[PDB]
Design a protein around this ligand. Structure first.
Ligand code: FES
Ligand code: FES
Lengths: 101, 101
């Protein structure tokens, strides 16, 4: 079982740190949701949860995978397939996007 | 390090499963936030994150603690202190409220 948390927080335009939604994170969340179901293997072992700010906004979109404890930053919708394949199915975090383990 | 996720999802009244917010979970979230921000031994090591539905709504309010992977249900605001003391600090999940590990 893996639990994927995607920050979907939006902020008003003057917020210094911006927001993950402004940086494309709702499209990230959507891309995870489109995968996790059109894939039987993902669907029965993976949960995708939208969240408010996880306090790393300037490095967003922020995606966290538990129980592994892998924090990703700068995630694009185009990166969701690699995270699904390599990490959620393969067990190997996508090193280039990691901001914390 | 502990990461607490509190479902704060609301739903319209016809939704069969209801919602964590209708079951008091925004007050649960607020209680966790107040506690962590005012406890010198948690404020540097604990994150409290609000979420959308985590697919256990009839057991709400749903609270999940990672990386432990402890799922709580039926959490009242009045139970937050016990979870903070016994689990977040003490390392012993509040057995009575656990719905999954
Ligand atoms: S808005 Fe996403 S981590 Fe702050
Ligand atoms: S509304 Fe909270 S788990 Fe579904």
């Amino acid at each position: 079982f893996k639990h994927v948390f995607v920050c979907v927080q939006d902020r008003p335009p003057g917020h210094p740190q911006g927001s993950c939604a402004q940086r494309g994170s709702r499209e990230v969340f959507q891309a995870f949701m489109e995968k996790i179901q059109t894939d039987p293997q993902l669907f029965m072992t993976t949960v995708i949860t939208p969240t408010g700010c996880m306090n790393a906004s300037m490095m967003g979109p922020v995606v966290v995978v538990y129980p592994d404890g892998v924090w990703y930053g700068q995630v694009k919708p185009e990166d969701v397939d690699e995270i699904v394949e390599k990490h959620l199915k393969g067990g190997e975090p996508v090193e280039r996007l990691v901001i914390s383990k």
